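TEACHING EXERCISE
Course module: macromolecular assemblies
Task: Read the component lines below, then compare them to the predicted structure of the full complex.
Student: A.B.
Group: 4
Components provided:
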Amino acid sequence: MMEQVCDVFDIYAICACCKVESKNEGKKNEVFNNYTFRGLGNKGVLPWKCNSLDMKYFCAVTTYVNESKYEKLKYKRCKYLNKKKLQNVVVMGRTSWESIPKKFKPLSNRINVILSRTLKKEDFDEDVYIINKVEDLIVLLGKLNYYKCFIIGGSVVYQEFLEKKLIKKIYFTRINSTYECDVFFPEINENEYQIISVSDVYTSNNTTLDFIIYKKTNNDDDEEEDDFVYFNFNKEKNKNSIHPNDFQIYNSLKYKYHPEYQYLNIIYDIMMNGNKQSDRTGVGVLSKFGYIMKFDLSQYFPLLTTKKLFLRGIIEELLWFIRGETNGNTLLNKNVRIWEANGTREFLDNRKLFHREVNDLGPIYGFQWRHFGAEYTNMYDNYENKGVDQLKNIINLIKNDPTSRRILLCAWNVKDLDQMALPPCHILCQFYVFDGKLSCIMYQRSCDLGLGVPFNIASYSIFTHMIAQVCNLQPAQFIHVLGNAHVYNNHIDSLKIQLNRIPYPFPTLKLNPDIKNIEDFTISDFTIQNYVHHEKISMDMAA
Amino acid sequence: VCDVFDIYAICACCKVESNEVFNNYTFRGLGNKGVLPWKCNSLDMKYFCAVTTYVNESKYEKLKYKRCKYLNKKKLQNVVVMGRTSWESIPKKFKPLSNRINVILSRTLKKEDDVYIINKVEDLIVLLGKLNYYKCFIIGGSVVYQEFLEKKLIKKIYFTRINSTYECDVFFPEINENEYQIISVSDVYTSNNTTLDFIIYKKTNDEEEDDFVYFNFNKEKNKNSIHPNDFQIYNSLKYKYHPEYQYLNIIYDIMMNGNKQSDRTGVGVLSKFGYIMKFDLSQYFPLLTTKKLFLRGIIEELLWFIRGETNGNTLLNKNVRIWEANGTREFLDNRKLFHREVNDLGPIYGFQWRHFGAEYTNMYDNYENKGVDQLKNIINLIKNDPTSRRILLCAWNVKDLDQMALPPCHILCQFYVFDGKLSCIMYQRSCDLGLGVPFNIASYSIFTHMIAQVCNLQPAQFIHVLGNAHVYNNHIDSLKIQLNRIPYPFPTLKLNPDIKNIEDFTISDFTIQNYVHHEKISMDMAA
Ligand SMILES: NC(=O)c1ccc[n+]([C@@H]2O[C@H](COP(=O)([O-])OP(=O)(O)OC[C@H]3O[C@@H](n4cnc5c(N)ncnc54)[C@H](OP(=O)(O)O)[C@@H]3O)[C@@H](O)[C@H]2O)c1
Ligand SMILES: NC(=O)c1ccc[n+]([C@@H]2O[C@H](COP(=O)([O-])OP(=O)(O)OC[C@H]3O[C@@H](n4cnc5c(N)ncnc54)[C@H](OP(=O)(O)O)[C@@H]3O)[C@@H](O)[C@H]2O)c1
Ligand SMILES: CCc1nc(N)nc(N)c1OCCCOc1cccc(-c2c(N)nc(N)nc2CC)c1
Ligand SMILES: CCc1nc(N)nc(N)c1OCCCOc1cccc(-c2c(N)nc(N)nc2CC)c1
Ligand SMILES: O=c1ccn([C@H]2C[C@H](O)[C@@H](COP(=O)(O)O)O2)c(=O)[nH]1
Ligand SMILES: O=c1ccn([C@H]2C[C@H](O)[C@@H](COP(=O)(O)O)O2)c(=O)[nH]1
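Instructor-supplied answer key:
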């Protein structure tokens, strides 16, 4: 039918935006949305000054060319208008041109185009095209051999290319930190543009960042392809009549590379392919067996962004573990209620623990970490130098025998299981040290995907940081192994909502760096920075 | 001519009735007494039918183009070509093959017998350059296969390996290793009490694509000093769907991206941290086929675990030497086990499985009713409470580690029961990919079958979680050889079905059936 200019000439935009220093009274319960990342410039320069990784990405996108795709674009552009090395075109406003240092101008291996009224060709020494209107560019592009055209900057330039409907896609970097800005990327209208791809999350220059792609919405061997269909002759409701169109946003994305998809894909897999089972009572799960997720802790802190999580509780839990404590009153006195239901009279009685005091959780994690194999008595007992201090041992092995394949911390004490309020969900941690870097595998026997797993990921990632620091190492991977992986029936609706949210780039965890012993951390040694998240979800929508 | 008309072959072959050596020619049995040697195979039937009745519509516009430039010039469906003996071997209820354009080579019967007949081999060429066909499949006859392959005329062979032995009288001709090579290997399946897989022999010589490259902007351009050349077969394969590739891809991954580490006296390893393999025990027994493996020792070791034994002499007296090195005077002394009798392995697997938490004394003590019999407990859990998420058998007793000759490599098993089916995860802290892991897979697959059978369940998946996964430096050469071998269809395992208590298995209760493998490899090539 009819062909758009943005389509024929392959006009794209590429930008990087940070969060903006807009002061608000109560930065607890701050609303986040796509408009959160909108800061483009300050006093003529970049708000964050310099980001090596955003630069590298920018260079990669704007200089990438595929010579074999060219003749199809050539014919196409020629058809539209009736009619060595290939380069991309970069287009920028004069102000952006002048902010670039001389040593870097014109941009290497690219056709440089500058928009100006105040300056003409005679005002530039360099190999650049000077145009004075957007129409001039379109004329120029009909006359050039070039691969793609990128609009690289000036909010004035971005606004008018978007105003004029000349952008096919936006390559948009989300710099996950706050800086003083005076210039802003225009608000992308969600009826005009949808996010189709989200990259991995990275760290560079002391910020996390990721890269997203917005697309303009709907206004000598090939003989091997068929073999694929043959080898697939035995496949198959998928199994479960959850619905397709419920996950419209989830399924519309092409590249789902943000590490949060490791968790969100498992939900989807379980929902679509899970086995229907029933716990003791009449709950109510879909289940599967055996998954692995991996999170790169040197690049980000994997606190889920598709809903709001608070960490104070799980940090206090972790510190309680490290102290060796089994006293549930300690947590309740800090208003942490994680262990409360498992400490009641009724709960303990139903475990046949008739001689256990309320909130005495028995020889659980803390006790096993510090005193494995000692004879549990009560929560107030002084177990000094009894049983195996496996926490101190693993710290010693990591410091003194880093290549050991025996650095395991294990909570599953078979002799003690029946004395515990409940057997541990998190069975063991194994460590691995290469080149001054520490990775952790945690094996989980039982995994409530909806409510527990988001916190568990956070817990063990924090613990890996803690162990790395006191051992003088850098954290590398946290690797989460899931045994029995299940989604409660009563969570499904809430998880559907969640699956259709686009993740934000992850936050970062900072530890007070003065802490040199595992026993020395307190709650104020922990900071989650730049947590950007979708709204709080109640997993059970009961009322 | 082969690329020209888009001609293919499709066949199924089995092994022939009569150490012994295996190769591609092992699978050659085509027919017996004028029928299929195995009589009927439903999966192979389903595959043949899916291959010879499939068309994608928008693909014949490119071939009215391409083909009709060689001889020089209602619904779209495929062509199937056979011989007279093949045709009259098919029951008439099915003839002619539905949705397919049949063709028969014959000297004696003619045209007046919408079915087609041809006089000579080259009478196909001419008859094809007349018709409306998507793709063309030579579908049978030893003789028909034979003289077609001699005259070099097939684009791809679609070849079913029926992994069992039957009486034969006609054979597929030995495919010449230079004319055709395997490019693709399916999943392994069970159907009609045999395993089988599907291989493809090939004749020897949208805005989002750039978005992919952009998302890969920060990757390295491949860490390690093994070579590209050396894995030619491995890199030449398109579809690597045989479950043996779970293992082979891990070796490749470690070889190419492994971290260089050196442990004890500087042996040298390549290592990575955290993999998962999964094997469908209902479809096959995952005994590696790219080298020769033996099981008597690992089965004995398992039986010894189940009895709760920690006595190393019991295994040595049966010439199972797996634990020998860990039971010497010098090994024990270096562990500081100065007060431990030679070959007294301490409170290892068997002791933990049957007596977790008891006080270990020596390998000869009577421990009846001391400690937690986890093994009995997990069995009772599977029977009484299959949906429990606590069905774990754990050997890592933290209290006992120093007393053990060594800490266990296999930390735990966890079990999962759905719809009368049993799955097992085993977590392994330390994995010798070259020598240990192939036995480890086999061991825990056997254990899974045993536990399932005594519980009246069918085995489903064995799931192997690898922690510290490593390849010794001096296995590398051997593993390069191994990666270039194409897997055979897996064998099957049969247990004596009478045994319904975990403690009542003996060595003669276990039979590996239809094990087809490449030759033994010395992992260390050292002499
Ligand atoms: N973070 C990012 O992705 C990114 C990218 C680029 C720039 N920046 C930052 O953004 C700021 C620059 O943006 P900005 O909005 O101030 O300026 P800009 O868009 O770079 O430049 C505006 C100027 O370009 C010329 N111009 C623009 N549109 C034109 C048209 N249609 N016809 C003729 N001339 C035209 C005019 O030049 P004359 O005044 O000479 O007529 C105009 O004054 C700086 O802070 C820079 O650091 C950020
Ligand atoms: N994939 C499989 O497993 C598969 C598939 C199909 C069949 N089979 C089995 O294979 C067996 C049949 O194989 P087979 O080779 O013995 O018989 P065949 O190949 O089916 O038939 C051979 C006959 O085809 C005709 N023919 C062959 N070459 C010719 C030429 N150049 N010109 C003219 N006519 C020619 C001759 O028939 P006349 O001279 O009598 O006209 C010849 O006797 C059966 O046992 C069947 O069950 C197996
Ligand atoms: C190339 C810009 C530059 N280069 C060196 N070598 N030094 C500087 N100080 C510098 O900044 C001058 C501030 C003017 O801002 C621009 C100018 C052009 C492009 C982008 C730009 C973009 N359009 N999309 C993404 N994703 N990321 C970036 C930043 C790399 C920003
Ligand atoms: C339709 C064949 C048939 N069907 C029923 N139900 N009973 C029979 N006795 C029977 O004939 C048995 C005699 C010979 O069969 C043929 C005839 C042509 C092709 C193949 C054939 C093939 N080329 N490649 C594969 N991979 N697998 C098969 C077996 C399905 C077998
Ligand atoms: O940190 C935790 C604590 C609990 N659970 C969930 C998993 C199970 O749903 C339940 C434990 O019950 P069993 O699986 O042990 O029955 O608690 C988690 O996922 N993470
Ligand atoms: O069943 C086994 C037993 C041992 N190993 C290997 C892995 C290691 O190379 C070594 C174990 O000793 P440490 O990792 O604890 O040194 O033995 C296996 O792969 N499988």
